[PDB]
Ligand binder design. Sequence first.
Ligand SMILES: CCCc1c(OCCCOc2ccc3c(ccn3CC(=O)O)c2)ccc2cc(C(=O)c3ccccc3)ccc12
Length: 271
Amino acid sequence: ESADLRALAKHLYDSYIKSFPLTKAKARAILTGKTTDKSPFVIYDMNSLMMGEDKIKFKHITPLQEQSKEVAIRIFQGCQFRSVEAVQEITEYAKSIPGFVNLDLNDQVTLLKYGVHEIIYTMLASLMNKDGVLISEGQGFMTREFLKSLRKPFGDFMEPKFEFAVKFNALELDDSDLAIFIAVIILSGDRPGLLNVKPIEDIQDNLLQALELQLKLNHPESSQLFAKLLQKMTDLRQIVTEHVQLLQVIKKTETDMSLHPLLQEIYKDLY
Ligand SMILES: CCCc1c(OCCCOc2ccc3c(ccn3CC(=O)O)c2)ccc2cc(C(=O)c3ccccc3)ccc12
């Protein structure tokens, strides 16, 4: 129902603002230079990487395994730590989606287990342009070309994300749009091993109607934006199946690699 659909939209945009500190609005301002907090330190090579890590002079530590290895491996590790933080933010957001915490608890685990990395890549695009990605809460910017440069396997984790982002970003979605799109993703009744499918679909159906209205109102001139966004769901699933495969490569080419227990849980027997 129309006002119900707008009340759902405004609800999700509100939890979204509450769960994710670095929104797209805030990322675009930094990327584009519109703010007056702190212009980002750019990492484009080995020497600037050293300086950027070794920055830590008025901006100090997060609980990440700081450094005991080569470059390719320690960038991977910072990816891991940050992807862990993101899971917590995304779980906090998921509890706010109406109907979510009412579902069978094994289903809640399962929607999270399969939805979290799709959401991670959707929202990473918010921090990216064609030239690179904002890192450490918008304090750093690491260039696409530096990332593409990395010794084989790791060089390949990054580029697909960039290719997806420039195209997703051409949709010009804003935070209020993303808040509904991300909930549509999580409420996906096709995740392997769901026990009660129909309650999830019913909730997703209502989010779909709300997403459609939201785009038609927010983006009047954008023909078929709703379909175009749902089409990106397929680029997202491909990103994740790709990433999982690059994970299997890392187990072969690398010595002790070692994921965080939360990440190990999510990847355990994943698709
Ligand atoms: C979600 C990851 C976001 C991200 C970057 O993303 C750009 C490409 C995104 O593609 C991904 C996303 C998640 C990933 C990987 C590789 C591993 N993961 C997480 C995993 O599934 O283990 C690749 C690039 C450099 C980063 C660098 C950091 C750092 O704090 C950092 C650590 C050491 C030196 C300099 C910076 C943190 C996040 C970064």
